[PDB]
Amino acid sequence: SECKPGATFENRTVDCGGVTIGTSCPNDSDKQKPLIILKNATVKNLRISASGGADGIHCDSGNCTIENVIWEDICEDAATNNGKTMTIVGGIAHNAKDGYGGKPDKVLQHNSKNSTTVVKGNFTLTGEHGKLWRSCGDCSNNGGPRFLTVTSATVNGTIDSIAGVNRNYGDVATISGLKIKNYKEGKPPVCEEFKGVVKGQGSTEKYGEKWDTTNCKVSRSGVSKL
Ligand SMILES: [Ca+2]
Ligand SMILES: [Zn+2]
Ligand SMILES: [Zn+2]
């Protein structure tokens, strides 16, 4: 029940005691493995070093919870939903321009279907970021629906956008309680609608930011300046 790179937790909750772990982060996806793999489990109070974020934490089965986890410099992505439910409870996720893993991209990667990623407990983003959550746009065996639930989160820094939903797959992002540093309408965009596709069967299309639509369930009242 120790927290170290390569660890897989299943049917239990693990308290890492606030320890720091990590491997490396070359700028290569061919070689970045997840630090922790979760299977109907929970991981808490864990720090991941700046030069060793690798491929983050994977929720490869069932319901998962990632509580009070700190990413000193997100490498490929922070956490990945390949299960039924992935809940992010608090924690801080830092990333930066000129950091490890290249230009900042996605924090939460969501690939499973008829699943839900949940962001609560005031999960915070620091530094420079790409997107908080993205429903895989061109995955192999892509489809939906994919759901995002944000009841509270803080972006103490910069970010390209918040959520990306695949309109043609029935994805729904429900956002509220979001605070963004220097927020202004469209700066940055919150919920954006896209057209998802199956890998090799076509290409993705961008529809842009939307408010209070079937797929983008966020009101202008749900996002505010930090
Ligand atoms: Ca990074
Ligand atoms: Zn990844
Ligand atoms: Zn995995």
Kindly report the CA angle at 154 between 167 and 109, in degrees rounded to 5?
A: 40
Angstrom distances, CA of residue 27 to CA of 64, 74, 124 = 28, 12, 24
Domain residues for the domain of 44 are 1-226
| Phi and psi angles of residue 58, each rounded to the nearest 5 degrees, phi first | -105, 135
129 is in an annotated binding site: no
Q: The tokens of 181 are what?
A: 């540093």
74 is in an annotated binding site: yes
Sign of CA dihedral 120, 109, 111, 211: positive
In DSSP terms, 182 is beta-bridged to none
95 is in an annotated binding site: yes
Kindly report the CA angle at 88 between 97 and 72, in degrees rounded to 5?
A: 30
> Determined by which method?
X-ray
Q: The tokens of 183 are what?
A: 């927020």
CATH, residue 29: 2.160.20.10
Going from the Cα of 13 to the center of ligand 2, the distance in angstroms, rounded, reads 22
* Count of domains observed in the chain: 1
Sign of CA dihedral 216, 190, 186, 55: negative
Going from the Cα of 52 to the center of ligand 1, the distance in angstroms, rounded, reads 10
> Can you tell me which residue has the tokens 């407990």?
121
Q: Report the alpha-carbon distance of residue 137 to residue 203 in Å, rounded.
A: 9
Going from the Cα of 77 to the center of ligand 3, the distance in angstroms, rounded, reads 12
Contact 70, 107 (CB under 8 A): no
Contact 47, 19 (CB under 8 A): yes
Going from the Cα of 109 to the center of ligand 3, the distance in angstroms, rounded, reads 11
